[PDB]
């Protein structure tokens, strides 16, 4: 996270760290959506051009964390993967369309003050919240700069941007399964996600029922916190029918 701030304790209790077993390192962000299911970006698990293709046994998820590198005894919970599910129409060849994947844990995770699921939006909460100008919140243990690493979870709030402005900031083909967020240069404030934040959540707190909803997944960007560029996010609601399908089935 570039130009954000330290998170408060328990601020993002749905935050998950995707951790590689050997070599032990941070893969990506992810989110807790129930006691056995974690949501992340497909690209965190599968990106053949870079010969990335993780299987279940390559990874751990760490839940309940704040410090990036510490083992947080009596606080974090570490879970093993039963099965990975990637969107079958995930477009890794072109633009990361449908950049979404689910991970089912081998055993349910115990909720706690530090461990708690986020909500997924329904149609109305997305129509109501996913508006240009409305701010969401991004969290992660990713890089502090485009070109070090934080000691604790970082947080930043960013406004959703107008689709034509998103489209005009990049040569990449944008789809309806994506949105972009970030400040414009004339706005002065700032912030962005960055390497290592990939797969983490973009959340909004509904002013109607005071619950946090995950509207986005950190998907891609061109650099980090560059003027005139914006972070891109997987549109969770848009892909909700696939999420529903997997969980109902499995």
């Amino acid at each position: 996270i570039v130009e954000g701030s330290d998170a408060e304790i328990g601020m993002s209790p749905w935050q998950v760290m995707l951790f590689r077993k050997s070599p032990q390192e941070l893969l990506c962000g992810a989110s807790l959506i129930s006691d056995r299911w974690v949501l992340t970006a497909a690209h965190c698990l599968l990106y053949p051009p870079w010969d990335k293709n993780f299987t279940e046994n390559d990874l751990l998820v760490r839940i309940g964390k704040h410090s990036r590198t510490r083992y947080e005894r009596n606080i974090e919970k570490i879970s093993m993967l039963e099965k990975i599910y990637i969107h079958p129409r995930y477009n890794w060849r072109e633009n990361l369309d449908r950049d979404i994947a689910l991970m089912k844990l081998k055993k349910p995770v115990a909720f706690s003050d530090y461990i708690h699921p986020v909500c997924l939006p329904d149609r109305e909460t997305a129509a109501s919240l996913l508006q240009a100008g409305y701010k969401g919140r991004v969290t992660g243990w990713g890089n502090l700069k485009e070109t070090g690493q934080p000691s604790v979870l970082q947080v930043v709030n960013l406004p959703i941007v107008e689709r034509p402005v998103c489209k005009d900031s990049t040569r990449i083909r944008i789809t309806d399964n994506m949105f972009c967020a970030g400040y414009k240069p004339d706005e002065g404030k700032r912030g962005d996600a960055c390497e290592g934040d990939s797969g983490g959540p973009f959340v909004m707190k509904s002013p109607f029922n005071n619950r946090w909803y995950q509207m986005g997944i950190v998907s891609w960007g061109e650099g980090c916190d560059r003027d005139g560029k914006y972070g891109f996010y997987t549109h969770v609601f848009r892909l909700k029918k696939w999420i529903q399908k997997v969980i109902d089935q499995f």
Partner: peptide, 27 residues
């Protein structure tokens, strides 16, 4: 269910340091 309600904030009626900035953007 209880999704999206944080034990250390919404459940005990405490606000974090920047959630009001979000609220204020929801015009």
């Amino acid at each position: 269910a209880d999704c999206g309600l944080r034990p250390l904030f919404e459940k005990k009626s405490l606000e974090d340091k920047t959630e009001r900035e979000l609220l204020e953007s929801y015009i």
